[PDB]
Amino acid sequence: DSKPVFIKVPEDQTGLSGGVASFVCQATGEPKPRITWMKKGKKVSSQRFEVIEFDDGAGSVLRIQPLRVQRDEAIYECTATNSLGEINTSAKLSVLEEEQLPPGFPSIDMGPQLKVVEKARTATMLCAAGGNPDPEISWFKDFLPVDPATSNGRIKQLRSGALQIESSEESDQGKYECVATNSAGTRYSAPANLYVRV
Numbered sequence: 294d295s296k297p298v299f300i301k302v303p304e305d306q307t308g309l310s311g312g313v314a315s316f317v318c319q320a321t322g323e324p325k326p327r328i329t330w331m332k333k334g335k336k337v338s339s340q341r342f343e344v345i346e347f348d349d350g351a352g353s354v355l356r357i358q359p360l361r362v363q364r365d366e367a368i369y370e371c372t373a374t375n376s377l378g379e380i381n382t383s384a385k386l387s388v389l390e391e392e393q394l395p396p397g398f399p400s401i402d403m404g405p406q407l408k409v410v411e412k413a414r415t416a417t418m419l420c421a422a423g424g425n426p427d428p429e430i431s432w433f434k435d436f437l438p439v440d441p442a443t444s445n446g447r448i449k450q451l452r453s454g455a456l457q458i459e460s461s462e463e464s465d466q467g468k469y470e471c472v473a474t475n476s477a478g479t480r481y482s483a484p485a486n487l488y489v490r491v
């Protein structure tokens with residue numbers, strides 16, 4: 294048995310009105326702990342917000358869309374509990390209007406497109422971004438983060454930003470979004486579907 298310990302924590306984030314923001318939190322322990330979200334010191338309702346679980350309840354994602362300045366700008370709190378102890382950690386969301394954007398805020402220069410692939414062949418989803426400084430890229434599939442380090446060689450992110458998927462199978466089907474981040478803020482691409490045929 295052991296007390297819970299964080300292996301992923303949410304960071305401060307600046308987004309754009311009409312857009313999307315996601316926060317991610319995850320912990321280990323024995324028995325497995327349970328994640329819960331709060332807004333301004335009160336528990337969030339799952340019949341009102343989009344909340345998506347993974348790792349048997351030991352990881353969770355809070356997604357907010359479309360962003361609105363008055364309602365959504367606030368302090369958000371993640372908490373993890375098992376029969377041996379409780380730990381917590383917080384982060385702040387800021388939301389900008391179009392005319393407040395600084396010149397180096399990130400942009401999508403070329404985004405991912407619809408793709409139909411035959412089983413057992415390779416599929417590639419492209420993404421090229423710009424800004425100042427140069428942004429870092431990450432990917433989401435059906436609202437959850439993609440982590441290549443667990444595909445045992447199948448799935449990889451290239452230095453250009455593209456996502457490459459070998460030996461395609463039925464579980465690879467779904468809706469993919471590219472995400473670009475730098476010291477000024479965050480921007481999402483439009484979503485694009487992958488289908489597996491024959």
Ligand SMILES: O=S(=O)(O)OC[C@H]1O[C@](O)(COS(=O)(=O)O)[C@@H](OS(=O)(=O)O)[C@@H]1OS(=O)(=O)O
Pocket residue numbers: 332341363364365
């Ligand atoms: O910007 S707000 O924080 O006000 O957001 C809107 C909130 O207005 C409330 O009515 C409560 O008002 S309050 O000022 O006393 O927090 C909540 O609605 S309710 O049905 O769950 O009770 C909303 O909660 S919220 O949207 O999930 O954040």
